[PDB]
Amino acid sequence: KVTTVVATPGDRPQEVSYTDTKVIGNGSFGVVYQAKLCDSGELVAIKKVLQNRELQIMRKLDHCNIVRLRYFFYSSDEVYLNLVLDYVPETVYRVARHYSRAKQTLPVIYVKLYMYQLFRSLAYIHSFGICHRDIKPQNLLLDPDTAVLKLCDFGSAKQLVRGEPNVSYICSRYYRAPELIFGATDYTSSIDVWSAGCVLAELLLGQPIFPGDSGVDQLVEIIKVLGTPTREQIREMNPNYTFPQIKAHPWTKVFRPRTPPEAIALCSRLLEYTPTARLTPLEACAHSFFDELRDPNVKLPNGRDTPALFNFTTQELSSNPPLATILIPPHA
Numbered sequence: 001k002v003t004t005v006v007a008t009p010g011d012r013p014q015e016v017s018y019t020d021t022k023v024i025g026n027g028s029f030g031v032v033y034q035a036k037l038c039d040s041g042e043l044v045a046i047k048k049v050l051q052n053r054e055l056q057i058m059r060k061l062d063h064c065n066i067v068r069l070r071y072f073f074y075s076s077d078e079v080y081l082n083l084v085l086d087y088v089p090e091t092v093y094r095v096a097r098h099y100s101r102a103k104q105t106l107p108v109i110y111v112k113l114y115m116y117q118l119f120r121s122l123a124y125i126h127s128f129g130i131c132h133r134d135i136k137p138q139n140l141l142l143d144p145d146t147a148v149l150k151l152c153d154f155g156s157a158k159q160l161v162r163g164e165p166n167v168s169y170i171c172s173r174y175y176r177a178p179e180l181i182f183g184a185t186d187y188t189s190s191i192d193v194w195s196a197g198c199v200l201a202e203l204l205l206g207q208p209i210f211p212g213d214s215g216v217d218q219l220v221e222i223i224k225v226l227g228t229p230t231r232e233q234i235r236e237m238n239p240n241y242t243f244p245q246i247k248a249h250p251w252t253k254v255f256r257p258r259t260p261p262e263a264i265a266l267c268s269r270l271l272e273y274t275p276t277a278r279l280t281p282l283e284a285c286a287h288s289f290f291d292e293l294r295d296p297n298v299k300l301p302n303g304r305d306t307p308a309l310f311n312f313t314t315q316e317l318s319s320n321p322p323l324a325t326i327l328i329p330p331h332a
């Protein structure tokens with residue numbers, strides 16, 4: 001059993017053949033398949049989307065921490081866009097769920113590795129003005145043996161342009177920045193930093209930090225930890241907006257007693273009401289929570305070497321070039 005399609009590399013079209021196709025995922029966009037290519041025997045993921053920005057964004061990206069677009073083709077009385085991506089066996093969500101179900105917390109070495117690679121992938125997309133707008137554990141692909149993380153699902157991604165409005169009802173509820181809940185249309189790529197902060201907090205906690213039962217109750221869940229946002233914080237989130245009045249809960253008492261203090265400190269700097277107050281992805285990479293990753297003697301728990309973490313390009317460093325000396329340890 002073989003499927004042959006006319007596909008373009010992720011230019012000149014060509015006959016692409018694959019076998020062992022099976023459904024692995026399902027969403028509003030359509031289906032996600034796992035298949036094996038004929039020429040190399042390599043496994044691929046095929047994202048089939050019924051019927052704009054995704055393909056254009058996916059074709060521009062070339063980073064170690066972003067899912068690689070191998071080929072693309074249109075198929076099947078309704079037309080679908082099929083994105084052929086290099087297959088990655090796991091997700092942060094599935095790994096975190098296994099630990100959660102077994103009443104265990106993910107070792108902080110993995111939390112450091114996954115969060116650092118997510119921030120690096122964010123520093124790269126934000127350098128082109130591209131905001132992902134769907135940062136959640138499910139969109140963080142993992143190779144369990146090498147601990148290499150790949151950001152995926154650019155279906156909500158948009159190149160943000162100052163002055164031009166954007167939809168407020170975006171991102172998965174639990175990872176939705178408070179300005180979006182307040183109905184902001186002039187938000188920045190800092191919405192992804194809030195989502196990344198929600199992912200970190202979830203990896204430390206064993207469950208989502210803000211589990212809202214609606215897009216409105218989502219703000220109430222944030223208030224239960226961060227306290228009520230001040231009038232100034234509300235103005236910085238959405239100036240057009242003219243909420244229970246309670247104080248912030250201590251950050252240390254949010255997480256289990258033995259949670260590393262640097263993890264707690266990083267959380268507080270990402271989960272800020274004021275969007276501008278939140279760390280940029282590059283500053284997050286530089287945080288003391290990622291110190292272990294800069295140690296020359298650092299290894300993965302299986303004894304293997306950690307992935308290449310400090311091979312930064314001029315593009316990733318463009319937001320703050322003098323950060324390079326702090327980010328790149330002397331051994332690298």
Ligand SMILES: COc1ccc(-c2ocnc2C(=O)NCCCn2cncn2)cc1Cl
Pocket residue numbers: 024025027032044045047067085086087088089090091094141152153154
């Ligand atoms: C919604 O968008 C996507 C969804 C997936 C990918 C993808 O890309 C490379 N690998 C995958 C992938 O799904 N791997 C399997 C991960 C674990 N798993 C889940 N169910 C069974 N196993 C890409 C895009 Cl863009």
